[PDB]
Ligand SMILES: CCCCCCCCCCCCCCCC(=O)O
C-alpha cells in the first residue's frame with residue numbers, strides 16, 4: 001500500500017509511575033534521629049536530673 | 050515534485066543561553082530558609098516575649 005505523509009510523529013518513550021509531592025509531615029523535624037533515640041534522650045534527661 | 054517519506058522530524062524550539070553561576074545577592078544569607086519562615090520567626094519572637 002502507499003501511505004500518506006505522517007499526520008502524527010511519534011516514537012518509543014519511557015513511562016514510569018508519576019511520583020508524589022511527598023508533603024512533609026508535621027513532626028518531621030524529628031526525622032534526623034530515630035524514635036528510639038528521642039525516647040532514650042527523655043529517659044536520660046530524667047535520670048540525669 | 051514528489052517528496053519521499055520523512056527521514057528526520059523537527060519542530061520549532063526555544064533557544065536560550067545556558068544558565069551560569071548566579072552572582073551572590075546582598076542578603077543571600079537568608080536563602081536557606083523561606084521568606085515565610087523568617088516572617089513567622091519574627092512573629093514567634095514577639096509572641097514568646
Ligand atoms: C532535654 C531532653 C529532652 C529534650 C526534648 C526532646 C523532644 C523530643 C521528644 C519527643 C519525641 C518522641 C519521638 C516520637 C516521634 C517519632 O520520632 O516517631
Ligand SMILES: CCCCCCCCCCCCCCCC(=O)O
Pocket residue numbers: 079080083084087088090091094
Ligand atoms: C528573632 C529575629 C531573627 C532574625 C530575623 C531576620 C530577618 C528579618 C526579616 C524577615 C523577612 C524578610 C527576610 C526574607 C526575605 C526573602 O528572602 O524574601
